[PDB]
Amino acid sequence: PSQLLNYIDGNFVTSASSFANINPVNGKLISDVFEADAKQVNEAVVAAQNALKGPWGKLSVQDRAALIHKIADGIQARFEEFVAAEVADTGRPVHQARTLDIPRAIANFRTFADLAKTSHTDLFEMSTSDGSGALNYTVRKPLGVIGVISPWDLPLLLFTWKVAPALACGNTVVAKPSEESPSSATLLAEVMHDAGVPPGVFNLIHGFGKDSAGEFLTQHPGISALTFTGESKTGSTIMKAVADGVKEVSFELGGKNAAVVFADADLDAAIEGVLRSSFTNSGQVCLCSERVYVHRSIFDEFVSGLKVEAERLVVGYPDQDGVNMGPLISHGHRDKVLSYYRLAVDEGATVVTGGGVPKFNDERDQGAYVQPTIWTGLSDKARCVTEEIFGPVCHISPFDDEDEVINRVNDSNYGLACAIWTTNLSRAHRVSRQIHVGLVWVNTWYLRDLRTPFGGVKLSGLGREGGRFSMDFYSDIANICIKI
Amino acid sequence: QLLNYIDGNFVTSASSFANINPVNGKLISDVFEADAKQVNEAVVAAQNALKGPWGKLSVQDRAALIHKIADGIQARFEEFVAAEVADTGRPVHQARTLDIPRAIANFRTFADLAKTSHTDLFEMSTSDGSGALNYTVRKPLGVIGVISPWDLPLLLFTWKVAPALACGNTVVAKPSEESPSSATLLAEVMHDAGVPPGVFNLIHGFGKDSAGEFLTQHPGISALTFTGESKTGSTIMKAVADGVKEVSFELGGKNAAVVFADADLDAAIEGVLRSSFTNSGQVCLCSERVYVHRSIFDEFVSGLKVEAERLVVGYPDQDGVNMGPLISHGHRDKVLSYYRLAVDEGATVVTGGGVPKFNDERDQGAYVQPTIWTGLSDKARCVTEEIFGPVCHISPFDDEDEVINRVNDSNYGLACAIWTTNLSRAHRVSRQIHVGLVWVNTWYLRDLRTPFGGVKLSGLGREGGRFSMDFYSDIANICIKI
Amino acid sequence: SQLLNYIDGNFVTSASSFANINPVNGKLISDVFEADAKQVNEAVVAAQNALKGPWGKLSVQDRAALIHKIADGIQARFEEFVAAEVADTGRPVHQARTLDIPRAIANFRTFADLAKTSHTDLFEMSTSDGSGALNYTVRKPLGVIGVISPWDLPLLLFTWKVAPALACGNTVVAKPSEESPSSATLLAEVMHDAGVPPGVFNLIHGFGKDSAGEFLTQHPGISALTFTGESKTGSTIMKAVADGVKEVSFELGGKNAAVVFADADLDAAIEGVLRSSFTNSGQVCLCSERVYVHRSIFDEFVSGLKVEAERLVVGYPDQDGVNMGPLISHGHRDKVLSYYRLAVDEGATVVTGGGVPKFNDERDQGAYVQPTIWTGLSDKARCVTEEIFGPVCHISPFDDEDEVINRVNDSNYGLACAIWTTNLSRAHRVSRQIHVGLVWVNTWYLRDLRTPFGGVKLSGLGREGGRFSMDFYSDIANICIKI
Amino acid sequence: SQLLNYIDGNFVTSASSFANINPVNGKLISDVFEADAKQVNEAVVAAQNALKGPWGKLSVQDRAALIHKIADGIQARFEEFVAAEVADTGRPVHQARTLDIPRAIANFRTFADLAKTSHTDLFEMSTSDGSGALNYTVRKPLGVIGVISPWDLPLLLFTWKVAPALACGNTVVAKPSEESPSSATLLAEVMHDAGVPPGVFNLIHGFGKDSAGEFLTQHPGISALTFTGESKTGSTIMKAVADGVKEVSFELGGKNAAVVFADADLDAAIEGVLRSSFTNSGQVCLCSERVYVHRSIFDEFVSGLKVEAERLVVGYPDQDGVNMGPLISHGHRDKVLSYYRLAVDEGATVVTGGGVPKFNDERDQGAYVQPTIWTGLSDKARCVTEEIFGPVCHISPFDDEDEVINRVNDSNYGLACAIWTTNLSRAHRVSRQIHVGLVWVNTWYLRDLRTPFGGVKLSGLGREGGRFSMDFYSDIANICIKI
Numbered sequence A: 001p002s003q004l005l006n007y008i009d010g011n012f013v014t015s016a017s018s019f020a021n022i023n024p025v026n027g028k029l030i031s032d033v034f035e036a037d038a039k040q041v042n043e044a045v046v047a048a049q050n051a052l053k054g055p056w057g058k059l060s061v062q063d064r065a066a067l068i069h070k071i072a073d074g075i076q077a078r079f080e081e082f083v084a085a086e087v088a089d090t091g092r093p094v095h096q097a098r099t100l101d102i103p104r105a106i107a108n109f110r111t112f113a114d115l116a117k118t119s120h121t122d123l124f125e126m127s128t129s130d131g132s133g134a135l136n137y138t139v140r141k142p143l144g145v146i147g148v149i150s151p152w153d154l155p156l157l158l159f160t161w162k163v164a165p166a167l168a169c170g171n172t173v174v175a176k177p178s179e180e181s182p183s184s185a186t187l188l189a190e191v192m193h194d195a196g197v198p199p200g201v202f203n204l205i206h207g208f209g210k211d212s213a214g215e216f217l218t219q220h221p222g223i224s225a226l227t228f229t230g231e232s233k234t235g236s237t238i239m240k241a242v243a244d245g246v247k248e249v250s251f252e253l254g255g256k257n258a259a260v261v262f263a264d265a266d267l268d269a270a271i272e273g274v275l276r277s278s279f280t281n282s283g284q285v286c287l288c289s290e291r292v293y294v295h296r297s298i299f300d301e302f303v304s305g306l307k308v309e310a311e312r313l314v315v316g317y318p319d320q321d322g323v324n325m326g327p328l329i330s331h332g333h334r335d336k337v338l339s340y341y342r343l344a345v346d347e348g349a350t351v352v353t354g355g356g357v358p359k360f361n362d363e364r365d366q367g368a369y370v371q372p373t374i375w376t377g378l379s380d381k382a383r384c385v386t387e388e389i390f391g392p393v394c395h396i397s398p399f400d401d402e403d404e405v406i407n408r409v410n411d412s413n414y415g416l417a418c419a420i421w422t423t424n425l426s427r428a429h430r431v432s433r434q435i436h437v438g439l440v441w442v443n444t445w446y447l448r449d450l451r452t453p454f455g456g457v458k459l460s461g462l463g464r465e466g467g468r469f470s471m472d473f474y475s476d477i478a479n480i481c482i483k484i
Numbered sequence B: 001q002l003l004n005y006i007d008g009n010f011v012t013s014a015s016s017f018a019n020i021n022p023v024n025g026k027l028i029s030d031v032f033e034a035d036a037k038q039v040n041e042a043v044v045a046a047q048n049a050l051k052g053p054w055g056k057l058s059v060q061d062r063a064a065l066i067h068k069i070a071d072g073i074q075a076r077f078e079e080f081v082a083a084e085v086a087d088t089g090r091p092v093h094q095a096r097t098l099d100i101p102r103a104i105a106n107f108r109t110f111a112d113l114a115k116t117s118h119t120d121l122f123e124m125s126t127s128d129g130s131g132a133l134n135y136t137v138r139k140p141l142g143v144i145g146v147i148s149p150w151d152l153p154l155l156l157f158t159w160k161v162a163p164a165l166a167c168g169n170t171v172v173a174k175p176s177e178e179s180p181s182s183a184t185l186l187a188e189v190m191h192d193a194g195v196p197p198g199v200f201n202l203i204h205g206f207g208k209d210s211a212g213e214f215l216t217q218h219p220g221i222s223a224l225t226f227t228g229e230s231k232t233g234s235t236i237m238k239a240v241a242d243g244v245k246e247v248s249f250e251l252g253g254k255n256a257a258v259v260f261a262d263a264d265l266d267a268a269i270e271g272v273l274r275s276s277f278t279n280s281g282q283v284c285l286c287s288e289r290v291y292v293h294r295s296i297f298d299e300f301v302s303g304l305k306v307e308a309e310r311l312v313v314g315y316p317d318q319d320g321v322n323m324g325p326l327i328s329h330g331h332r333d334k335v336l337s338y339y340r341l342a343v344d345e346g347a348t349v350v351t352g353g354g355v356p357k358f359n360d361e362r363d364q365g366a367y368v369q370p371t372i373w374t375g376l377s378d379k380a381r382c383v384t385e386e387i388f389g390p391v392c393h394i395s396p397f398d399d400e401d402e403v404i405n406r407v408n409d410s411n412y413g414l415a416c417a418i419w420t421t422n423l424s425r426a427h428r429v430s431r432q433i434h435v436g437l438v439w440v441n442t443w444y445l446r447d448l449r450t451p452f453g454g455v456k457l458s459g460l461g462r463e464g465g466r467f468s469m470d471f472y473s474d475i476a477n478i479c480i481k482i
Numbered sequence C, D: 001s002q003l004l005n006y007i008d009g010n011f012v013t014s015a016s017s018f019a020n021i022n023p024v025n026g027k028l029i030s031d032v033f034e035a036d037a038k039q040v041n042e043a044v045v046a047a048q049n050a051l052k053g054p055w056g057k058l059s060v061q062d063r064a065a066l067i068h069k070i071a072d073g074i075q076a077r078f079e080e081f082v083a084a085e086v087a088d089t090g091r092p093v094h095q096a097r098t099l100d101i102p103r104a105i106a107n108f109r110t111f112a113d114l115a116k117t118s119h120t121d122l123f124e125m126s127t128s129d130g131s132g133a134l135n136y137t138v139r140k141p142l143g144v145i146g147v148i149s150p151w152d153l154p155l156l157l158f159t160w161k162v163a164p165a166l167a168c169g170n171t172v173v174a175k176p177s178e179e180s181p182s183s184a185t186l187l188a189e190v191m192h193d194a195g196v197p198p199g200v201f202n203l204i205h206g207f208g209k210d211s212a213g214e215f216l217t218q219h220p221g222i223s224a225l226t227f228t229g230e231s232k233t234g235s236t237i238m239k240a241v242a243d244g245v246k247e248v249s250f251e252l253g254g255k256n257a258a259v260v261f262a263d264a265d266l267d268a269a270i271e272g273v274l275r276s277s278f279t280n281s282g283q284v285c286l287c288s289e290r291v292y293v294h295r296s297i298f299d300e301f302v303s304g305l306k307v308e309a310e311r312l313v314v315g316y317p318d319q320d321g322v323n324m325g326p327l328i329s330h331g332h333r334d335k336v337l338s339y340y341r342l343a344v345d346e347g348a349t350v351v352t353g354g355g356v357p358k359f360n361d362e363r364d365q366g367a368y369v370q371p372t373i374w375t376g377l378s379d380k381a382r383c384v385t386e387e388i389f390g391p392v393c394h395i396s397p398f399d400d401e402d403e404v405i406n407r408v409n410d411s412n413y414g415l416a417c418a419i420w421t422t423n424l425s426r427a428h429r430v431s432r433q434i435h436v437g438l439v440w441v442n443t444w445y446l447r448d449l450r451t452p453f454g455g456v457k458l459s460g461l462g463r464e465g466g467r468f469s470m471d472f473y474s475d476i477a478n479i480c481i482k483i
């Protein structure tokens, strides 16, 4: 049907082999995607290094920012095409693509263009023995060639989350989107081309990880940095792969995030919030809550309430009326999720709702759907309470005491996000600062200010991105000291 | 004898190893090597200390306690001088003016930064019209693993330790096997200042199959900050990858100095002498490559030769001394093998090129002579590989763009010194040098607030000023929906 | 027994003297030499000259080191400063030991630290010729700072201005309140003993109009006038420096509210408002003289506050369990009593106090009044709108959140506000809507010295504290290099 | 042609009208309605009210998008705006196309972007009970900003104040110079067409004393007065707002120096000084009217400048290769020629110019003068010390670096300075010692809108640009939460 090409040194190019892009709604072939080989990857990196010496490297910060705004304009002008591309690849509801995914990708470019325009560096004066003094000033320069490897849960959002600041800081890019979701990135390349981004500045390579484009990219000595969002295990692998070149790295990895509902929470608001934090994108967001802790005094009522709301969720077509949830990304991912559904029963869970796959009795039965699922009854040590499942599921457990629940939230090798529900002023601030995660929300979930630092602790990440943190990571910070 | 310091106690080990004075090859002390069991004990005690009295100090009180650590060092100044000198053979004057005062400055400066540092507040609108607040907070990262080298032992040791403690972390610190004494005195100051048990832990030993490796492998740490060789950095980066530990690396360099035709020539010769031979060339920041404009080349080399030959090589306390020995015999071996390699590569030996004769104990030491080469290609191994001795190669250049390209044609990128009196040239050329630090008309001048680090193989991340306050802290974002 | 000026490194007397009077008993405690215009000029000129001297040559590190020595010198004479503050003001010894003196010391240490750690900015830009340019900023001393301070927190407010002034490398001509000259004089001594170069810090005594205060504000030799005191005086001063376009920084009056919502920790709010209304006998610019309490807890709040207010021990600064000393002066008490009288005329119910206590001893010769609580006045009453500056508050009920926000903001002042509530959204939602420089939630007068401090409307001009002081007390210059 | 006030979303006329006069030929350009006190009041009330309308409800993001639309509206009418600026002032068309109009558009865009990216501060602190506290700051609109602007760079300086005011969520009552009312009026059209809510931006026309300008500064309804103009006028406005303790920001006069050191690129310095003395016919606050040149190159410098100055084309704004239009007005020319005579009387050597060109056409009815260069005056001459605001410079030799620094600083003004040297150390060492707000090395009037801008001494009060504007045009509030 469609073909998704690579984009290398200003041209769309095919490849020797291609792989299948499968619509998870109905199991059908969407497109063939040409897999970049090591030769093509090297050509992309070499093109990126050279482009640093071309027109791009000569642009003022203002001209660079203006061009980046043009990239955003071009996405905006093809908004519905990008919507259709994200949807076809992932089965996400159209409304979500229209309200979250595509706007945020546009916003990624604008915000970092803006940050680039307004950012400055530092001036330090000092005295010296000869009483004449000295000046130290800092400058931001492009780091060089940035390798980008991105996942399939929020394909264009996370892809642009990395590409936007990379370009805003004057770097050049070689980027490999998830093999599960390569469409919107390919459209982005067309927008880059049409906007007049110079050849070699942005390069798109398609492929898998190991023994494919992903691995070839991480191993190339020509990149200056590798920014990556994905599985924790994959982060470790990549970190080993770039260690010999001491490449700069930035990792946003797994999580087993908790939501906590205190007895003084607005209960209806918390039920709705947790529904959202557990089942958005069918539980396929790094930020989703797979552990929920609810005060003993409201536990039964919270659980009954969430069950009803979960069962009201419409699981169906992306453009179906009132749809809330699409399928999982792939049959392969469904197999992982269902084996955890199985594991939970074996570990002693009560299945409050879901626990299987919906039966549609139409073509969607050939897709990769599962049911939104709630468990109770597992110990804090259960595998299903400790390992990231990355599906539409949450286990819910009671607690009695604030310090107790804080300790249970923190008792994890992960540390990405946490959502806390309480109407109490002191409790909100006191509790939040004690959660060992990069991001806490109070009385909401996944509310984003793009200027904030974003990242995780422990196995969930290395480094911070967002705002000035991206401006620092994607730049060479250099100190120049002048003796006066 | 030098003991480990673990959970408030000085403890011995099943193995000890020799601390050899490099001036005369004499034994200074036996050093107990921490085994894996003891490294685990240091790490567990570090973790627990976070939950004790240390973790409950206000920022102001923490900073006060840190200023007390600095006072402790100052009150035992000469004792610290003596330890640094003994281990390494550095000139007494260098220790008194550079090494020890900087260590004190390290603690004081980061104490001050901690007291005055703040974070950010972001306001935003939301659909419902009520809005939201996002604010950031800096928390202790947790347990910081510190592994440090021998060139500037106390300075570099405390360059990591001070911000780590100022940010409320606890520390397991492993100083170089070549220079364990001043770090052991520090553990004494820490103890006498009433730093809670477990907050600062000193473990002695080597790298592979030793305390260093054991530290980097321990899942209980939250970060590893390292200063040493590039290949060691790569190794440690691999070691901590499975736990995805935060890392900060300051690694090797092959730094260049550049003398433009319009430089103040006498100041340039003096500056490059300092940048080449300070601490006997054993500083990561030393210039081992020098580029001089063709029109002043011969005059420069002659002038440098003379100055280089007036340098006094001898006892650390021998009045007028300029250079002590290299850190060790093993290290002199490496340096001498490079001395041979330069000749085999076709170098003219303008001066030095071997080892001085003393006819006393110093011949049992590990001395070499300050050495200057000319006549090698940019691709010669002695021009590209870090020697870490008191040596430089000098090469003529003709064009500005030429010398910039030649400076950057390196797998390293730590620092560069440039000499010129021209305003435009100074700033135009500076911004093009692909390194972490550029000095103009000076060398190794340091403001502790500035970002410090290297690019390419010379490092990962930046430390100093807010970059240390950021690295040694968890930055967390809290979002309140209103 | 004699308080001298400190000019160009010398303690000097003056032509005229005035009486420093203990408000506990009305007894003369010292004679204070009033600086005339000639001595004021001499002080400014000496401060100008010191800029060109060793002080101008100090590195920021060295300067900060010396400022810490000043702090050390206050610490070493801690109890004498306490005695000095107490003697002049009648404030409880406990307050002087825990609030007044330690904050003066912290003032010097904090701004020395800020000076040591502050840096400025680098901006890169592109140029037509493609070579680019660099813009960088530096902080330089502004010059000579004229400091004028009030009597409510004498040493705290005096050092609140002098510390950053000196931290930024300025020289200083400072004029403390006629009512409280003692601690400033001891501070001169500490400067002297610390070896602060002559002319760097100059202390002139006197009054305002037609005296040392007036003369300083009109001297063309100063680069800036920072002032804390009455709003009308701020206006006067602003006109006086106009011809010179001097930099100005004003912290002026207020009529601050406290608001207690139905979901507040009622016991904590009662204690809180008690502190906010009667601390330093209600003689702090930040004090709450208007209080709004939700209808559902009004009666219970007023009853609880009455009991606590009546438990307050009014007496000698070193009297065991003392909570309140006297007002600053007999003249100040006469104003406060004229307001007590006015409240009654305006129809107030006097919940407690409303007059002066009878001690039957020397205190009856001093300047005491009772802690006083009113109810029953409308928002337009003069006792509800004009700053009294005594140990008093009016309490009014309210019903709605938007209502009480409007009544708080319906004022020509806008210094500070305290809000009591346990609700998270309300705390943040209400706080941001109060038109003042400083809001506290579930506390009062908690100070982080890094934060901007100041008022809006008639309560001020500019901000001080942290980065704001480093900016105000500095010349910020941009240097632009074409490459 | 006719220029109306813009109030509460409506263009309105007035009882009084005055003439807009083309300085090129003395012809009438338009009539301008002078707003009276009633209308100024109407503007301020409208502005106050608009704070409570739709404007006050916009998110920072949406407010910023609107401001970008304002900039779009000026871009869409670019040439009309060029025509207006040129007509009012006689400035070269080229300068209006490359400096004046583009900077106005950039002003709005830059502050819109600053608003979008700016954040405030979070301070944590410990407390006695061990639970801690949070201090956070927020930026809120200050309120109604009164803006009063001069005629040297009409739209640039007008929008330099209007853009940050609107970006910080304030509402505006703005009074452009009587000499240059056109572009501001066209700006009102752009705002209207972009759908800026009524009352958010108000335009009042008139003069100073007994007119719109004075009335604006006296109105108790404004929250701040930002002003650019003569030093004396700044002093007057500062007195006028003092009773309200209104926030103030002043960018005032200057008598700026250029310094040419012996190691300067001589040709570049000659060209640079020519630009800095004669651009906009010397009618820019940033122009150099004093020039110091090292003795060794003095004669060579003066000769070169004389020749370059005599090659300058003085004529029509669109004339081929024109360098200078006329002065703003015959009245201003009268003042300038008065200074031309005075210099002769003070004993100056007129190196070039010193009179008015003879055109033999309609330009003879205009307000032209010749670019003029003087030598031989002492540092104390009136012509070397008072701001002339015409196309003129005096040149004097110096021998020593410390000497010339002292001579540059020996002034009651302190706006800007341009320095010419090829030496690295000297550029940085000398620049930091010059007591002005802005120094340029090897260039002049190079602007980065993020930098602090302002002057010292009589040249101003406070800073604007970048974070400094974000601070001046906002209420900075501190909110302290006890946890």
Ligand SMILES: NC(=O)c1ccc[n+]([C@@H]2O[C@H](COP(=O)([O-])OP(=O)(O)OC[C@H]3O[C@@H](n4cnc5c(N)ncnc54)[C@H](O)[C@@H]3O)[C@@H](O)[C@H]2O)c1
Pocket: B147, B148, B149, B150, B151, B152, B156, B174, B175, B176, B177, B205, B206, B207, B208, B211, B212, B213, B214, B216, B227, B228, B229, B230, B232, B233, B235, B236, B249, B250, B251, B252, B253, B283, B284, B386, B388, B414, B454, B458, B459
């Ligand atoms: N970039 C900088 O700022 C900086 C500063 C000083 C020194 N250096 C570099 O340090 C080097 C010289 O010092 P060095 O010889 O001690 O370097 P090194 O790598 O051999 O040793 C450094 C430290 O790491 C430890 N170590 C060695 N192997 C280890 C391992 N496998 N696991 C854990 N720890 C291990 C050592 O015991 C020692 O404490 C030079 O390359 C020099 O450039 C760099």
Ligand SMILES: NC(=O)c1ccc[n+]([C@@H]2O[C@H](COP(=O)([O-])OP(=O)(O)OC[C@H]3O[C@@H](n4cnc5c(N)ncnc54)[C@H](O)[C@@H]3O)[C@@H](O)[C@H]2O)c1
Pocket: C148, C149, C150, C151, C152, C153, C157, C175, C176, C177, C178, C206, C207, C208, C209, C210, C213, C214, C217, C228, C229, C230, C231, C233, C234, C236, C237, C251, C252, C253, C254, C284, C285, C387, C389, C415, C455, C459, C460
């Ligand atoms: N906003 C704040 O932070 C703050 C802090 C403390 C006090 N205050 C205010 O201070 C007032 C009480 O103190 P006060 O009675 O001493 O006020 P005041 O303004 O009458 O006197 C203050 C100082 O200014 C001097 N002074 C008086 N007239 C002067 C003049 N014409 N020119 C120059 N100096 C003059 C006085 O001698 C004294 O030193 C209260 O209104 C209180 O709110 C405000």
Ligand code: NA
Pocket: A021, A022, A023, A024, A088, A089, A090, A180, A181, A329
């Ligand atoms: Na797919």
Ligand code: NA
Pocket: B018, B019, B020, B021, B022, B087, B088, B177, B178, B179
């Ligand atoms: Na040794």
Ligand code: NA
Pocket: C020, C021, C022, C023, C087, C088, C089, C179, C180, C328
């Ligand atoms: Na008194």
Ligand code: NA
Pocket: D020, D021, D022, D023, D087, D088, D089, D179, D180, D328
């Ligand atoms: Na006109």
